[PDB]
Amino acid sequence: GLDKYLPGIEKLRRGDGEVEVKSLAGKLVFFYFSASWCPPCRGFTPQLIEFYDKFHESKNFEVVFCTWDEEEDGFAGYFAKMPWLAVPFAQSEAVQKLSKHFNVESIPTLIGVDADSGDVVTTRARATLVKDPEGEQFPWKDA
């Protein structure tokens, strides 16, 4: 189901190593579009980390950082501060195309899709998460 969003990407970053995209079977996957340079990302990222630490297991989801940073050497530093996965910096073309697919015009943006079906679940999770820190309305389904 994820083939559509990350064509021919089989591995994602996690800490200093990697995981197979196959390990996301059955999960809700949030693509998190952000950058070290983005002012509103600074305040949002820690709110997402809190939500992830509390609920990624119990609510069965994963976060995949999709960078808008264009400085390679900053990538390590910025992703190092996150607990989840990332599209590798060298697969930035895939991130750009995904950003276009979802009409991401500003960051931060958080889009949730079902890994198995590829179906879009929510496109507004950056807005809804800040008003729902306990995830009482998770996964904030689009109409």
Describe the overall structure.
With 143 residues, this protein is α/β, with parallel strands linked by helices. It has one domain (1-143): Glutaredoxin. It has 4 helices and 7 strands. It has a 7-stranded mixed beta sheet. The longest helix is centred in the N-terminal third of the chain and has 17 residues, at 39-55. It is globular. It starts with 10 loop residues before the first strand and ends in a 12-residue tail after the last helix. The PDB classes it as electron transport. The entry lists the keywords synchrotron radiation, disulfide bonds tryparedoxin, crithidia fasciculata, thioredoxin, trypanosome, anomalous dispersion, oxidative stress, oxidoreductase, electron transport. The assembly is monomeric.
Strand residue percentage: 15-25%
Can you write the helix and strand succession as a string?
Answer: EEEHEHEHEEH
The computed structural class is alpha/beta
* CATH 4th-level superfamily: Glutaredoxin
The tally of structural domains comes to: 1
CATH topology: Glutaredoxin
What spatial order of strands do you see in the largest sheet?
2-1-5-4-3-6-7
Number of contiguous helices: 4
- β-strand number: 7
| CATH architectural type | 3-Layer(aba) Sandwich
Radius of gyration: 14 Å
Q: What summary fits the major beta sheet?
A: 7 strands, mixed
PDB class: electron transport
Keywords: tryparedoxin-I, synchrotron radiation, disulfide bonds tryparedoxin, crithidia fasciculata, thioredoxin, trypanosome, anomalous dispersion, oxidative stress, oxidoreductase, electron transport
Assembly: monomeric
Entry title: Radiation-reduced Tryparedoxin-I
